[PDB]
């Protein structure tokens, strides 16, 4: 089979260092990478976050899990596909390392963010595709993604959480679930005020469980949207993909400016306040606003 073949190549490979793979960079890009290569980067992300060790993940199982995740994104979807999930994970990784967020969180939280970033759009069909009620929003889409995530975590050969104790397992699933549900922009809009207001007053505090949970949610949105922060030539390219999905052009630049003002700037400003080293995200986002604004006329 084409697929057990893919599993063999992947399990046999030597995983280059994080530095060699450029996965520590906020300006990372996946355009020139093969599927196999994105899988290796992903293993390096688990490894250098020290998650394979702390939680005793078997190599064959992690490899199989990554391939399952990859397999359950649809390639025919121009933007909401595996590369988007892979990029969201890479940005999470870079915020934890380069952005120095790692030290602010527990191992279990880090574990759950990485998994959530990779799984958060599982089985997406495209924004233009959409039982009972369904009456009041409620993140139906994200519930589906999380269910997909859960089913893969429980598939034979795919159980990367088997090394956790039952109590750790339950805590981790809860975090994964909240994390995936947090990628619903509506929820993000609903909750950001609290977070901004708190940073305003220099009252923000990670020791408060309520605030921790709020921060993790903000963190997910920041990664989920991070394409908006990439170097111009790359951002233009990703914008291309999004437009293809949204519509299957003269108004696109102003749309981009609207999106950056409405959603992105404040979030990346807030994240910078929490950790100054996440500044490149904010900086990259500002430069892109300037560029799209110039096209907008
Ligand atoms: C480039 C084509 C047009 O792109 C957009 C147009 C509108 C918006 S939006 O007004 O903030 N918005 C549209 C309605 N959604 C449910 C939420 C997002 C975002 C985007 C948009 N979203 C994303 C990116 C982007 O470049 N544009 C990259 C990360 C996600
Ligand atoms: Mg989504
Ligand atoms: Zn997403």
Curated annotation (Swiss-Prot):
Zn(2+) binds at residues 84, 120-121, 224. The active site is at residue 80. Expressed in aortic smooth muscle cells, heart, placenta, skeletal muscle and pancreas and, to a much lesser extent, in brain, liver and lung. Changing residue 235 to Y: Changes substrate selectivity from cGMP-specific to dual cAMP and cGMP binding and hydrolysis. Belongs to the cyclic nucleotide phosphodiesterase family. Composed of a C-terminal catalytic domain containing two putative divalent metal sites and an N-terminal regulatory domain which contains two homologous allosteric cGMP-binding regions, A and B. This is cGMP-specific 3',5'-cyclic phosphodiesterase.
